[PDB]
Known about the structure:
- The structure is cut from a larger assembly and holds chains A, B, C, D, E and F.
- Chain A is α+β, with helices and mostly antiparallel strands.
- Chain A is about 45% helix and about 15% strand.
- In chain A, strands 1-2-3-4 form a four-stranded antiparallel beta sheet.
- The longest helix of chain A has about 40 residues, at about 125-165.
- By secondary structure, chain B is an all-beta fold.
- Chain B has no helices and 28 strands.
- Chain B has strands at about 1-5, 15, 20-25, 30-40, 40-50, 55-60, 65-70, 75-80, 85-90, 100-105, 110-115, 120-125, 130-135, 145-150, 155-160, 165-170, 195, 205-210, 215-220, 225-230, 235-240, 245-255, 255-260, 270-275, 280-285, 285-290, 300-305, 310-314.
- Chain B has an eight-stranded mixed beta sheet, with no helix packed on it.
- Chain F is mainly α.
- Chain F has one domain: Actin-related protein 2/3 complex subunit 3 (Arp2/3 complex 21 kDa subunit ARPC3).
- The longest helix of chain F is centred in the C-terminal third of the chain and has 23 residues, at about 125-145.
- Chain F is globular, with a radius of gyration of 16 Å.
- Classes of the chains: A alpha+beta, B mainly beta, C mainly alpha, D alpha+beta, E alpha+beta, F mainly alpha.
- The complex binds adenosine-5'-diphosphate (ADP) (2 copies) and magnesium ion.
- Chain A: This is Actin-related protein 2/3 complex subunit 4.
- Chain A: It comes from Bos taurus (Bovine).
Amino acid sequence: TATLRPYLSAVRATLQAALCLENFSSQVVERHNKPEVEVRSSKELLLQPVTISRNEKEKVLIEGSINSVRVSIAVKQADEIEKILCHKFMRFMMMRAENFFILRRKPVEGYDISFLITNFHTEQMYKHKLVDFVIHFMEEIDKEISEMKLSVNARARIVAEEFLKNF
Amino acid sequence: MAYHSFLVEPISCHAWNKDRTQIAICPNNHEVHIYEKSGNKWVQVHELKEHNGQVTGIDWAPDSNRIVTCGTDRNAYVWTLKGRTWKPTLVILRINRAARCVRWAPNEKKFAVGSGSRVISICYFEQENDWWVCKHIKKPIRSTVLSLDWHPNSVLLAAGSCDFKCRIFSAYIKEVEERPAPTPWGSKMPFGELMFESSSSCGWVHGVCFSANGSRVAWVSHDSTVCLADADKKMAVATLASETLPLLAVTFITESSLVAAGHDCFPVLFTYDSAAGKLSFGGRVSQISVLSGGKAKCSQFCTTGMDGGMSIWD
Amino acid sequence: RFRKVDVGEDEGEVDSCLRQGNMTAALQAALKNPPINTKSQAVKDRAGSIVLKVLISFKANDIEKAVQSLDKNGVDLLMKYIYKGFESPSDNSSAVLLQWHEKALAAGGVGSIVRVLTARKTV
Amino acid sequence: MDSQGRKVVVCDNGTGFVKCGYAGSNFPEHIFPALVGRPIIRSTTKVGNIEIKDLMVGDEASELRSMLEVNYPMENGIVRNWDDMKHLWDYTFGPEKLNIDTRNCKILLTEPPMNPTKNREKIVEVMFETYQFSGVYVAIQAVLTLYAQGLLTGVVVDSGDGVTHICPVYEGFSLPHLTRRLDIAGRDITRYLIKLLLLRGYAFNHSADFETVRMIKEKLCYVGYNIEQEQKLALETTVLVESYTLPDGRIIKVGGERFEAPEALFQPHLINVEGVGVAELLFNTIQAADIDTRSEFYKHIVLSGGSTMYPGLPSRLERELKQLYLERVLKGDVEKLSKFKIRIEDPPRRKHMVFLGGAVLADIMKDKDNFWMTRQE
Amino acid sequence: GRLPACVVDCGTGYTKLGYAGNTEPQFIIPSCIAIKESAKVGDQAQRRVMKGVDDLDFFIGDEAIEKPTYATKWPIRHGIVEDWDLMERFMEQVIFKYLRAEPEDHYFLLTEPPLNTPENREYTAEIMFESFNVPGLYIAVQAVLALAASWTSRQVGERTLTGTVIDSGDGVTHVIPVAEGYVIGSCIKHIPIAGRDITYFIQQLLRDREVGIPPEQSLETAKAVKERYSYVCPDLVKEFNKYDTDGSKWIKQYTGINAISKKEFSIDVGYERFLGPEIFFHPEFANPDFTQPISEVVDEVIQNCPIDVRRPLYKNIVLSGGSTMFRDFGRRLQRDLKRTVDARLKLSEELSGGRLKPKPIDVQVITHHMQRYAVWFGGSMLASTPEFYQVCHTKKDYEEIGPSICRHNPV
Amino acid sequence: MPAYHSSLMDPDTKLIGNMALLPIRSQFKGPAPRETKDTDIVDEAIYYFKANVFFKNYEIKNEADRTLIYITLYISECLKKLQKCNSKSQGEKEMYTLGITNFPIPGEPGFPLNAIYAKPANKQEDEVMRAYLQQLRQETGLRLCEKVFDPQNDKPSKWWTCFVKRQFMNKSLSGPGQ
Ligand SMILES: Nc1ncnc2c1ncn2[C@@H]1O[C@H](COP(=O)(O)OP(=O)(O)O)[C@@H](O)[C@H]1O
Ligand SMILES: Nc1ncnc2c1ncn2[C@@H]1O[C@H](COP(=O)(O)OP(=O)(O)O)[C@@H](O)[C@H]1O
Ligand SMILES: [Mg+2]
């Protein structure tokens, strides 16, 4: 229902506030340094989860912490065919998480993809370009799925021709 | 903006020599580099490399010319310039988790280390062993201690913490120091008594500072808020919330003005008036320090940040 | 097996102002009662539902005047309710809350959002 | 030092690092690797103006090591090369380090416990029949960490490069039958680290690169605290993958190998060694001590040597001991465990505690003759 | 009735295909794929983009090695699958064109190199369970199958269930100690030399010495002289002197046919008769960073094994894989080992005063005619057994747990 | 690993710098004594050359290895000249003029192994090892010239000239400074 420009702008202003990360050695093991949003072992270092959604199916969850932020987002699988094609697209993107330094190797339960930014990423990478990548993903994902649906339809038609024409 | 990029990587602490001819920095590793102002351009003059893990705080005692360092290796070391090369002295710090901050006392007889072990170690020299020994402040600190500042009487110590609360503690070490005079914070001040507690409950407390009279503490919190507790109003605390990102460090520059800095990457001035007891955003990264004129009447102050490099302001 | 051992561990006024058409005050009327202290859960869901009724029933062109009438406390409360309504999606609700967000953001800035994230006593 | 003015040197002759200095010091005067090398020409590495002497030793033999073939003269606590080790001592007492007239010095040495007797015999021989020291004393690595800690009772978990030992001492009495070796120590973890990085696709396979993977290990490895958490974290997210630059500037990515390698201390079967990890071996040592000494030993577990420095080792080791005590002593009575007072002494200065113990003991003993072997007998 | 399981051995040089219960593979095919290259007119800016059914216009095996308008690609490198896009297509035509097995009702035995990264087992199971729809899969360790092939073929009474297996495919060489049928995985060592390195070293050495081989056929001729004229030499420096002095007998003419002009060409074949397979004993030739001879690595593997098994292993060193087939290969490996072990014993006499003389060690190196397809045969015998259908991962297991069921390995 | 190393380090044989002045069985003038055994260090180098150039690691046992390696570096240089020669007569005349050129000595710049040879400090060291290394070069070139040319046609034979590209562990006695 709601248009795409307000939804992205609300997400951007939220995510811009959550990337105020810091370096923070953990309290629970001698001198381990680990993202509190994933280890969750002390709870005065976790921020209140916040959620932005444009309808009942497309929602972005932001889970902050003193040293990390986890961003997990869901996209509308409007067709039976899109569920398959979206799962495969996410799988093949998630299969390369060592190159997308901010990407988890598994999604958060009930979300299609989920990013994890550490303080180190906001120190080494351009922080504002990490936001722009999350936004650029969120803009393009459904155009990319639509292209796959068309390209599969095309293949099915050409393969049907190559059988029938021989009779 | 005077500026110089020592490193691309986060300058994780800095401390200044007595006459500001030299600056000590962490280049985002377990070594401390000292640079001398070789005319217009900085040149590295020493590399203190005894730590076994990342240094998290540096301080430089201006009268005694000694450098104290602490780190996530749970070490602290006091560095003395033996002839030409800096040599370390052991600190028996006795903490089971990372150190996070260090500050020399104004009289340079003692220093304090804040840590992840939910304690403040107060260190003083034990000359029969030629090592430094600790007493621990402990009881009300519920989480890690992020920043420290000393009252000018070298007894009262203000501490910020992840359990959202600024506090003032009496670090009176009876072994090394004559009993302090009474203060507006209180007349009692045996070791580890709790003089003050913040009203706050939400954000972590990143930075804490005393006025040069010691009658005021200000702190800054992850709420993007500044507060100032004034002892002459009997510890009434001003508050100002702001529209920008959080503030990471703060200093007084006069009894009635602050400078602060934060994730917005630029310094911000907050003035205060003793009449109404309100802070005001006079407006305009990782820590701030005063170069000249001190906390009473600063003429220059400087900043360093995760974005790298050093910057000087007037 | 050693390795596996676990060890070492208001509504009658709100609908009155709405029915009077005092909509700007109807926003204020909702924000007077923050159930921040409440241990009860259902009180929170009730308070959020009441404020959502005002946010939805507001006319879209008047949201600018409504938000601008709040103080900085009200703006931080308004944000804390805005981010709550996003967790109960409904066909219209998300479209208006995304607009209330943009105007509350223009008033309160990103700092107002940080005080949503840092709020230790969840409303 | 002496009233005779003789200096008292303390020389912890470790299989990895020589750790050296004088009595009464709070620090070792010099740390350098027990390493010896000869120049070699290679087609790959360039040659330059840095002259490689026909023998190089110590720090220089490690720093220049790309042009060198290098040996450790000592293995698993045993001297392999009485020639190269003499060159290592010739360097230690030479102009580069402690520039000492050895005939003017007393020396304190260390020996690992349960070592073979011909090892000590040859050491005591050369200290008179080559260096001609004014006096010699061999001190047990177990008691020296207790001196460095200021204690008179404890169980020492001494874990160097070569071998790991568990050694109880009770009120200054030695309990020698309780001494247990474990054949896992820092060199085996470094060989195991190589064998994992080869699976990731990086070949090292040289003596020079044996030291490179040690520097990876020290910088990047850590002992996992809850091994199921560490494997979940690596399977769920990329966070562990941390990048290291080789001396030539090749970039490598190190992932779960950061904790899988040190885990050999706690699941020895990941290496070929049959046995049980340091935690269970320690527990079985204390549960062999006389019944009422046991409750003191749990309050004085003392860690020693560089292979204890892995982030999280004291936390992990203390947890494994609580798990075993609940399983085997309390028979599952979970609430009774709250009375179990366990302390692991994990002082930050840990690595050099064998040397700092010798410094303390020599400072105590210097004028108190009838201690050093003397008159070259 | 009950249909025989499929056995596929994805070699770095030759893939081997067939059904369980046969004494030979039905096809031996080079593990390459020919794809239509005309896309290179557009693909100057970025990798070829596929549309329509263009990705079905490809050939594999002998249909692909010399086609005039397709670029040959070699998907497998050090035994690992390096480009899963091409390997996934290679599997399609293997199953449907050659075997003509409907995947839905045939179990697959699919081999693995011991160096295979866990991530690559996840992908290979994911393709077989989810791109295809195999009812059950078993990723089998090549070395054990090679030993069992010798066990089941060799004479009764000498069928020892213990041995050291040296497998030298085209990509990498593995030295695997086995005792009582258990792989001692901790003690495995890998030698980074195999048929490709021997081929490339000959290929370089011809291109220094013998310009006139056309670049397209530079690989063909290096492969041909390797397989037909090369032998393991007894002593290197002496062999050069033999070739220099009796060159009339040692230098052999090879005559090749030009792929395009179909003119003949000819070359002398010389030092690259004994150079080449020498790189097994002097890896520093072909590889900058490996230096232990194979006859050194084999002893280090055995002398790390438990003390009881060391003597049994020396009695049954098994050679496997085509790169071990050079003439006189095993004869020299034995000699080098024997010289290494008997000296190890002789030292322990002196360090015991001769009070006791140790029993010798009988180093024996064994060879068998399956060596071109020994791993495959060992698989086809395993896959005939009823236990195989109990050992396989069933498709339902991949429904309860993801690809993660294939993380594990013998090490 | 083990490339071929020098056999003939007799304890009687004197050193200059880090090189052993082994006797030479040559008619050329020079300071080392006249060898009379069949094998000689120049013939060790020439006998090993084809094998030795393939190894890529080389561990110096003694000064004689620093001597024999120098010969192989010089053989890997003389092959460059004589592959161009139309006849053995041309090569023999050419090779005499090659070896007399003033090749660098230890530590003099452009010498390829400044890390591994130390410069002679004094005239009676320097001049004598120049007078030694010269006669090594003179003999070494002539002994190749006898055997690289095939006697049927004075073709500089394929089997020897094949090695010209294969510099001894990528070290050139020409020196990388030129
Ligand atoms: N920070 C560290 N973390 C883990 N291991 C370390 C660290 N620093 C050194 N080591 C290991 O410590 C060993 C050094 O030997 P050392 O502790 O001196 O034992 P020894 O005195 O018996 O030789 C080496 O194996 C080295 O890899
Ligand atoms: N008679 C032979 N002598 C030497 N090598 C041979 C001979 N026949 C085949 N080869 C080589 O065997 C190598 C490996 O073949 P194969 O064992 O099928 O490899 P893989 O099974 O690992 O794919 C090939 O490079 C081939 O050239
Ligand atoms: Mg040691």
